[PDB]
Amino acid sequence: EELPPRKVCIVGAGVSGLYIAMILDDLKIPNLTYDIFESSSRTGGRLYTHHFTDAKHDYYDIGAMRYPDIPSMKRTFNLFKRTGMPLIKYYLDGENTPQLYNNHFFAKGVVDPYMVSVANGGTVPDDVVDSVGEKLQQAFGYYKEKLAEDFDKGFDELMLVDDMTTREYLKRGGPKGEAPKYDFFAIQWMETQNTGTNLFDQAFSESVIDSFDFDNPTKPEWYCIEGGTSLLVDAMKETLVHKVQNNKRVEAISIDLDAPDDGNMSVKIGGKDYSGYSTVFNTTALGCLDRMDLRGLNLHPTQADAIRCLHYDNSTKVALKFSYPWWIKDCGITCGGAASTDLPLRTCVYPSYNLGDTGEAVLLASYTWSQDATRIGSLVKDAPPPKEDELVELILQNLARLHAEHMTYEKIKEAYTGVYHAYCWANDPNVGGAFALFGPGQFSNLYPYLMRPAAGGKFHIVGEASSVHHAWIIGSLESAYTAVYQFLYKYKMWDYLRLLLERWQY
Amino acid sequence: EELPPRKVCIVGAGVSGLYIAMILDDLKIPNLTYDIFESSSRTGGRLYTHHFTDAKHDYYDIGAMRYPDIPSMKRTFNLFKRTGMPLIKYYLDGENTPQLYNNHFFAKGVVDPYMVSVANGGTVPDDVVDSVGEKLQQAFGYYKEKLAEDFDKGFDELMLVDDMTTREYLKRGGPKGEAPKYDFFAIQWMETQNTGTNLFDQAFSESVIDSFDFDNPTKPEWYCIEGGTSLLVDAMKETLVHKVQNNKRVEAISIDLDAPDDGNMSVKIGGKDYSGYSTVFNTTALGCLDRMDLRGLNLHPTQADAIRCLHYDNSTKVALKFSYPWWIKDCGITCGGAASTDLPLRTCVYPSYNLGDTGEAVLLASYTWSQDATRIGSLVKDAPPPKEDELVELILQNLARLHAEHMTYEKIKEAYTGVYHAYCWANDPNVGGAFALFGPGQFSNLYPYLMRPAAGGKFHIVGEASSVHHAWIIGSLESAYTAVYQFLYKYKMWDYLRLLLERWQY
Ligand SMILES: Cc1cc2nc3c(=O)[nH]c(=O)nc-3n(C[C@H](O)[C@H](O)[C@H](O)COP(=O)(O)OP(=O)(O)OC[C@H]3O[C@@H](n4cnc5c(N)ncnc54)[C@H](O)[C@@H]3O)c2cc1C
Ligand SMILES: Cc1cc2nc3c(=O)[nH]c(=O)nc-3n(C[C@H](O)[C@H](O)[C@H](O)COP(=O)(O)OP(=O)(O)OC[C@H]3O[C@@H](n4cnc5c(N)ncnc54)[C@H](O)[C@@H]3O)c2cc1C
Ligand SMILES: N[C@@H](CCCC[NH3+])C(=O)O
Ligand SMILES: N[C@@H](CCCC[NH3+])C(=O)O
């Protein structure tokens, strides 16, 4: 045919790298091939299901686990459709889930059940202690509703306040001082009830977008993948024309500007050079890109500074196997959902995929973020198997306190099988963190320099951090789609660019 | 004698716990004993020297390593005197140390050597790019000089602005908007040149106190301990009347309010109860205290919230052994100091304790904080020994770029012995972090509730975080001293309280 031989390089076989390869396989551009290199021995990146055994429900999702049916997520559910993903309902809110703060259980209708307000000798203002949801919907609500109208325009309006942290916004009452002003302890309590420890000190725009996703105006249903999110990776993996090359950690990316041809880019793997690429799509988390030698690409200094400085949140999960689902049978927690607490485990997630089992059951006993995750992570080994006895003992004791209304410590201990697994994303060298969670001013100042193609339009920084949808599959997918667009555009492949718009624009 | 038998419990054998025991041994209060329990098999906590071998200079300090001779540090140098510590000069600034940002070496007298300013197509304002030190001394200088006058009063005046982050202070120009206002990229560059990644998003008071310690107005000399900071632990350890009990991890602290006697406090260790304590001094980092069952102490909710929420900074060190000190012989870096860079290693510290050696030499190749430390930490194992090959390769490549003016990669590689060691404090279960580094408003709001004795004046939260001198030995020592004071006071031991003031108040 007409189009000259071209070869592109995809760095990373997570969902964004796999999506790029899937788009290319679909477009069937003549004489175009790709190599996809993955540092880990495992494919999927932050799509990661841990199977204790291959029994139907004997797993937990270490990375992505739940997906809300909202318009901005269409591209995700389209990917689920293309791959035949078996979806089931995910109960964000179930029933009878305990909530434990300051050693008091939540009680419906009671004033200050946790006894943390000034009226009971605490420091939380009485006007705040029981109206956290309402006060935050007043600080976020305008932006959240504009994000439902149209996410891109809603995002642009939110960028007018991006210089503020959530705590800053609440202390001053908006950019003009017109919204309510809150003291420290009121802001602290709103953070304690709404997110993870310290996270109101990150961007206000990120708190708004997380409220938009977890408490969307259209009260959506949630879904998960029966058999684990890694089924998606398997489906995508197997469709590929060129298989993932695992155990291939890219150490350098370069473009030879002394050579005028299309394929003048290289990557270095294990000290060996891989050359002849007309475009390199990097899909790693930014911490991994930060460690590569990128001198050969002549990046803009501020783009380089974004790679180093864009903030990543931590996250840790601990899953315990029990001989029967005691939370279902003894506590009446029959419909998924999650228990929240100021105890170290913070959040205990009841699986939505084993609701009708009666024997061995997995419990996502601890799901943490930020400093909470770093503290649990200090007791965790991501490769290995003393400090994880300490971890197990800690989780069991927190679990007994959290379910004290119906359960004793001895009974939870007796039901425990001795099988557990835990994971801390910051300790994963292939990610270096859990997911982007920008600081104040980062989305409006650093991000646009992150997203500009480099090496004369041949280098793309792709992935969840390269999107407005951090910590969601949708970000990875949009960013991947956008990079393919720029690639086609850059090489003036107008027939295939139109074909992309028809077959792949949602 | 008159005084009835009493027994106190010291949780943790770091420097604050060891100092408490040393004070008590000195006061020789009749019928008073103590137990000191340490979770680790090793004593010293964040005083931690790693000896590759027992040769005189073949070590690096994983925790504390350097001490500035300033008035607020007197108590530390007094402890050094009491224990016979061999001090030598520590060169904060040495000579010929390279600085590498945006792949350009620093050049004295050049305008924008790193080529990051707007005038060269960057984003750093031209009025900022080369005057970072001056602009920050204008934002900090007033407070730093008042801290030299008198640290306690200087600290109290700094608490009037404690609600602001450093970035907030710089974006608005002080609490009244009277100081200069800086845009994002100017603030970003000040952070890049002055501290670790993202740390201007923490408290402005903490940036001020770090500028006060590392750039004190009285331009002080710095010292380190010849043979490693762990010599201090050995000296303190050996003087104790009651030896540290290692491998004793406290899991719970309680007071039995149904029993009226002095010794009504207990701790739980390995599920066994240890009772009969008239006071418990907890000296652990707060993340460790957060994991204990403290229901038996009826803590104030806001005190509990401080334990969970006070922010900890991360820190990671990597030390490599070389067959000769090539930085001395080939690069003319003969007087210690440190090289700084935007490369992943961030800071390379040249030891001040092997300046005259010519054979095998240790290099502190990487010293990082915050998100920089988490990223290096993801390649590190704190107990164990693939990802640390990646770590070594990364450090060697960064070292070649940083010393490119006098060294090649192959030559640095050839000089490398294959012996290295690395450590990440956030991954240490016995600490859970590196050291306190408070967020906005935390020092002025959460801290005072941290410091109030609990359990009717019998429970003390002691350590560096329980002081105004975070991440310094002086904080631990002051906080320990203060807890002993309150203990004596609480039990009306007036003769021994005066004796404390005579023998131990600096
Ligand atoms: C704890 C957690 C929970 C989440 N929950 C949800 C959820 O409920 N719903 C949802 O929609 N999303 C969720 N997400 C987000 C989602 O999992 C991610 O956004 C997405 O999977 C990231 O895909 P990616 O391809 O952009 O990045 P990655 O998954 O990180 O892919 C990058 C790949 O590059 C590889 N790599 C790294 N360095 C190199 C190198 N030098 N050379 C070669 N390869 C390299 C990595 O091993 C990895 O496989 C969650 C994320 C986390 C961390
Ligand atoms: C990277 C780094 C560099 C530093 N550099 C310097 C420097 O140059 N100069 C300086 O002056 N200071 C420096 N410091 C600060 C100094 O090292 C610390 O402030 C000080 O050593 C802390 O002493 P501590 O007793 O308060 O806490 P710790 O050292 O943490 O002591 C607490 C002890 O309690 C133990 N413990 C934990 N949990 C339990 C439990 N459940 N039961 C029983 N025991 C338990 C821990 O194992 C530990 O031994 C540095 C700190 C770090 C992290
Ligand atoms: N998407 C992830 C993280 C969302 C919050 C990101 N700051 C989840 O469902 O938990
Ligand atoms: N005292 C430590 C840390 C100081 C900075 C604390 N935020 C050092 O000398 O490096």
Residue B254 has phi, psi (to 5 degrees) of -145, 155
Nearest to B155 by CA among B208, B211, B214: B208
Query: Distance (Å, rounded) from C-alpha A394 to C-alpha A320?
Result: 12
Please report, for residues A70, A380, A386, A486, B40, the alpha-carbon distance to residue A392 in angstroms, rounded to integers and kept in the order given: 37, 10, 10, 48, 18
One domain, residues B380 and B416: yes
Query: Distance (Å, rounded) from C-alpha A365 to C-alpha B31?
Result: 47
Residue A413 has a CB neighbour count (10 Å cut-off) of 14
- Choose from A165, A249, A302, A443 for mutation: most chain B CBs within 10 A: A302
Query: Distance (Å, rounded) from C-alpha A106 to C-alpha A214?
Result: 21
CB crowding A145-175: b at 16 or more within 10 Å, else e: ebbbeebeebbeebbebbbbbbbbbbbbebe
Q: Are B57 and B460 in contact (CB under 8 A)?
A: no
Q: CA-based Rg of chain A, rounded to a whole angstrom?
A: 24
DSSP of B346-400, one letter per residue?
Answer: -EEEPPSS-TT--SSEEEEEEEEEHHHHHHHHTT--SS---HHHHHHHHHHHHHH
One domain, residues A360 and A296: no
Judged by CB atoms closer than 8 Å, whether chains meet at B314 and A374 is answered as yes
For residue A314 the two structure tokens come to: 């931590």
Judged by CB atoms closer than 8 Å, whether chains meet at A377 and B202 is answered as no
User: By alpha-carbon position, which residue is closest to atom 3 of ligand 4?
Assistant: B471
Q: Are B202 and B440 in contact (CB under 8 A)?
A: yes
Judged by CB atoms closer than 8 Å, whether chains meet at A184 and B201 is answered as no
Length, in residues, of chain A: 506
One domain, residues B378 and B482: no
Domain boundary (B214, B241, B265) is at B214
SS3 A492: coil
Q: Nearest bound ligand to CA B17?
A: 2
Looking at the CA of residue B285, tell me the nearest atom of ligand 2. 30
Residues with Cβ within 6 A of ligand 2?
B 11-17, 37-40, 45-47, 63-67, 249-250, 283-285, 288, 315, 425, 430-431, 434-435, 463-464, 471-473, 475-476
Q: Does residue A274 sit within a domain?
A: yes
Element spanning B8, H or E: strand B6-11
Determine how β-strand A416-424 pairs with β-strand A315-322. Answer: antiparallel
One domain, residues B337 and B423: yes
**Beta-ladder partners of B222:** B68, B90
Amino acid at B159: M
One domain, residues A261 and A362: no
B210 lines ligand 4 (CB under 6 A): yes
Amino acid at A117: S
Helix axes A494-504, A473-490, angle to 10 degrees: 160
Residues with Cβ within 6 A of ligand 1?
A 11-17, 37-40, 45-47, 63-67, 249-250, 283-285, 288, 315, 425, 430-431, 434-435, 463-464, 471-473, 475-476
- CB contacts of B315 in chain A (<8 Å) are none
Q: Does residue A121 sit within a domain?
A: no
Query: Distance (Å, rounded) from C-alpha B138 to C-alpha B132?
Result: 10
One domain, residues A423 and A334: yes
Q: Does residue B445 sit within a domain?
A: yes
Judged by CB atoms closer than 8 Å, whether chains meet at A429 and B114 is answered as no
Length, in residues, of chain B: 506
Amino acid at A404: A
One domain, residues A326 and A418: yes
Query: Distance (Å, rounded) from C-alpha A287 to C-alpha B220?
Result: 37
Question: Which chain B residue is nearest to residue A203, measuring alpha carbons?
Answer: B201
Domain boundary (B188, B214, B240) is at B214
Q: CA-based Rg of chain B, rounded to a whole angstrom?
A: 24
One domain, residues A321 and A417: yes
Name the structure determination technique.
X-ray
Nearest to A223 by CA among A36, A67, A37: A67
Determine how β-strand B347-349 pairs with β-strand B338-341. Answer: antiparallel
DSSP of A174-208, one letter per residue?
Answer: STTS-SPP--HHHHHHHHHHHSSTTGGGSBHHHHH
SS3 A221: coil
One domain, residues B190 and B270: no
Nearest to A38 by CA among A207, A302, A236: A236
One domain, residues B317 and B292: no
Query: Distance (Å, rounded) from C-alpha A42 to C-alpha A60?
Result: 16
Total of domains in chain B:
3
Residue with tokens 């009878």: A96
Domain boundary (B397, B427, B457) is at B427
Residue ranges of E strands in A376-502? 416-424, 435-436, 459-461
One domain, residues A322 and A414: yes
CA B255 to chain CA centroid, Å, is 31
Judged by CB atoms closer than 8 Å, whether chains meet at B290 and A165 is answered as no
Query: Distance (Å, rounded) from C-alpha B15 to C-alpha B31?
Result: 24
Q: Which residues contact B401 (CB under 8 A, 6 or more apart)?
A: B100, B103, B341, B343
Nearest to B425 by CA among B347, B367, B464, B349: B367
Q: Give the burial class of A241: count Cβ atoms within 10 A of its Cβ; 0-12 exposed, 13-18 middle, 19 or more buried.
A: exposed
Q: Are A397 and A409 in contact (CB under 8 A)?
A: yes
For residue B466 the two structure tokens come to: 């329980």
Residue with tokens 């500028």: B211
Looking at the CA of residue A210, tell me the nearest atom of ligand 3. 5
**What resolution does the deposited structure have, in angstroms?**
2.3
One domain, residues A288 and A352: no
Question: Which chain A residue is nearest to residue B163, measuring alpha carbons?
Answer: A184
Q: Give the burial class of B378: count Cβ atoms within 10 A of its Cβ; 0-12 exposed, 13-18 middle, 19 or more buried.
A: buried
Q: Are A326 and A415 in contact (CB under 8 A)?
A: yes
SS3 B342: coil
Query: Distance (Å, rounded) from C-alpha B139 to C-alpha B410?
Result: 44
Query: Distance (Å, rounded) from C-alpha A506 to C-alpha A82?
Result: 13
Judged by CB atoms closer than 8 Å, whether chains meet at A188 and B301 is answered as no
Judged by CB atoms closer than 8 Å, whether chains meet at B293 and A397 is answered as yes
For residue A485 the two structure tokens come to: 């667009």
Q: Are A296 and A456 in contact (CB under 8 A)?
A: no
Positive or negative torsion for Cα A477, A479, A483, A485: positive
Q: Which residues contact B374 (CB under 8 A, 6 or more apart)?
A: A312, A314, A426, A432, A433, B314, B316, B424, B426
Residue A182 belongs to domain spanning: 131-214
Q: Which residues contact A411 (CB under 8 A, 6 or more apart)?
A: A326, A330
Query: Distance (Å, rounded) from C-alpha A173 to C-alpha B437?
Result: 26
Q: Is B309 annotated as a binding residue?
A: no
CATH at residue A260: 3.50.50.60
Q: Is A159 annotated as a binding residue?
A: no
Q: Is B473 annotated as a binding residue?
A: yes
Which residue among A300, A390, A432 sits closest to B375, beta carbon to beta carbon?
A432
User: By alpha-carbon position, which residue is closest to atom 9 of ligand 4?
Assistant: B66
Residue with tokens 């991501």: A382
Query: Distance (Å, rounded) from C-alpha A310 to C-alpha B459?
Result: 41
For residue A272 the two structure tokens come to: 């060996």
